[PDB]
Amino acid sequence: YEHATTMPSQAGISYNTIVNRAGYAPLPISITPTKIKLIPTVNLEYVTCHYKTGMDSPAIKCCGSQECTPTYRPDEQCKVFTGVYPFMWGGAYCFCDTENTQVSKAYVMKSDDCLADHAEAYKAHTASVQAFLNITVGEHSIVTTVYVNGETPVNFNGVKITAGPLSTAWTPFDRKIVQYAGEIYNYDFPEYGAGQPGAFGDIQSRTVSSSDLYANTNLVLQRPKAGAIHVPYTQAPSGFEQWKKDKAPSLKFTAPFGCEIYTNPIRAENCAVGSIPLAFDIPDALFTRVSETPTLSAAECTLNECVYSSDFGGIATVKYSASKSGKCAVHVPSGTATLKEAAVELTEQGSATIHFSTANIHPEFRLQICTSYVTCKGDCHPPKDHIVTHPQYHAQTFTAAV
Numbered sequence: 001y002e003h004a005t006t007m008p009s010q011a012g013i014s015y016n017t018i019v020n021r022a023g024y025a026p027l028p029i030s031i032t033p034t035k036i037k038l039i040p041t042v043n044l045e046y047v048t049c050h051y052k053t054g055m056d057s058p059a060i061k062c063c064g065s066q067e068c069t070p071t072y073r074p075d076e077q078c079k080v081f082t083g084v085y086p087f088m089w090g091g092a093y094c095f096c097d098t099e100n101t102q103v104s105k106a107y108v109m110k111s112d113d114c115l116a117d118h119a120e121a122y123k124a125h126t127a128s129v130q131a132f133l134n135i136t137v138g139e140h141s142i143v144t145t146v147y148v149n150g151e152t153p154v155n156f157n158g159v160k161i162t163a164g165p166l167s168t169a170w171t172p173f174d175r176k177i178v179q180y181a182g183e184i185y186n187y188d189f190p191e192y193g194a195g196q197p198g199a200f201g202d203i204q205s206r207t208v209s210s211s212d213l214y215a216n217t218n219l220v221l222q223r224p225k226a227g228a229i230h231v232p233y234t235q236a237p238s239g240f241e242q243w244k245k246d247k248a249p250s251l252k253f254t255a256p257f258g259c260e261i262y263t264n265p266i267r268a269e270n271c272a273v274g275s276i277p278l279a280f281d282i283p284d285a286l287f288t289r290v291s292e293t294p295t296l297s298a299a300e301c302t303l304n305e306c307v308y309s310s311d312f313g314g315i316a317t318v319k320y321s322a323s324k325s326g327k328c329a330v331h332v333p334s335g336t337a338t339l340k341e342a343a344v345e346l347t348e349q350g351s352a353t354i355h356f357s358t359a360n361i362h363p364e365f366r367l368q369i370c371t372s373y374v375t376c377k378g379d380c381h382p383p384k385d386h387i388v389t390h391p392q393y394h395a396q397t398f399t400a401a402v
């Protein structure tokens with residue numbers, strides 16, 4: 001039997017329903033998503049880190065000419081400064097006053113700490129939603145991880161569960177993101193091969209172990225001081241450091257819909273966004289006839305207490321006269337009231353207690369119970385505290401009138 005019902009995509013809050021037919025007893029169904037995960041399809045564009053400016057030892061020729069011998073290292077600068085007269089701890093290096101030459105060259109390379117202190121620049125394409133759910137059908141219970149795509153089923157005990165596509169496809173990650181120190185940032189980093197100096201991406205590598213290294217650090221050499229041996233260089237300050245100094249708070253403190261953000265895998269969890277269109281294919285063999293189950297006759301309902309509140313502040317007693325003692329389900333076919341409990345136990349004729357949370361100030365709802373239903377009605381009072389530390393349990397509704 002094919003049944004389908006939208007389930008609000010809230011983490012920690014439960015959801016209940018009853019599936020029934022003209023000659024088959026109510027079969028309860030309960031769902032509880034303990035963690036809804038939003039993994040995006042992601043690939044690595046590069047990794048960046050602090051640079052370090054390596055530099056070959058100056059090659060000094062005493063009154064002889066030199067040449068800018070080229071090598072091919074990242075962001076290389078090579079220059080042949082003439083008219084030098086260097087000094088060491090032992091005195092003047094050369095005897096010719098003029099015509100001495102010093103060839104000096106400098107280059108960029110990855111910091112020694114880049115293997116463990118680096119930022120990963122990624123592109124995030126599309127979303128994949130998977131949720132850890134607790135599903136019960138007529139006391140057949142399962143705890144699983146369902147891939148929310150409408151395709152992948154979870155088929156334990158013969159009932160086939162399919163969690164349709166997340167109704168409002170949405171991600172907190174833009175197309176192009178960055179990971180650093182276990183925090184995910186939305187940042188339009190330069191494409192590989194366009195990194196500009198003094199900003200994020202000044203040095204880049206396709207992988208942490210990649211041989212290639214593009215560097216654009218605005219490296220330019222200056223002539224050394226007379227009587228000193230060294231390689232002067234003025235360079236744009238490390239763009240990665242500047243990004244660290246100047247960056248907005250991570251998505252874990254700015255993401256919409258209250259999403260939590262985690263980094264392995266890159267993902268967002270507990271996004272209170274949209275709803276999951278669950279579809280349940282219940283086998284014909286799991287249904288039970290109305291005759292077998294406890295049948296209720298001549299029930300009455302009364303709200304012995306009502307506190308219009310986020311939690312289950314509403315209490316109602318049902319006086320029952322059952323045909324045979326046992327257990328059976330209880331529900332409200334309406335968004336007015338959401339029940340804490342799924343089923344109750346009955347002993348011939350007596351009373352039972354139902355907990356619920358409500359939106360209506362003047363509540364009235366049909367409590368469906370054990371192959372019957374009773375019209376519960378009453379007046380309800382406001383709650384105590386202005387602010388509470390948990391999310392809503394009761395479906396909001398327009399009617400809150402006198």
Ligand SMILES: *[C@@H]1O[C@H](CO)[C@@H](O)[C@H](O)[C@H]1NC(C)=O
Pocket residue numbers: 032034134143
């Ligand atoms: C779901 O099942 C798991 C089983 O480990 C349990 O720990 C968790 O509390 C259950 N959640 C609810 C309230 O259904």
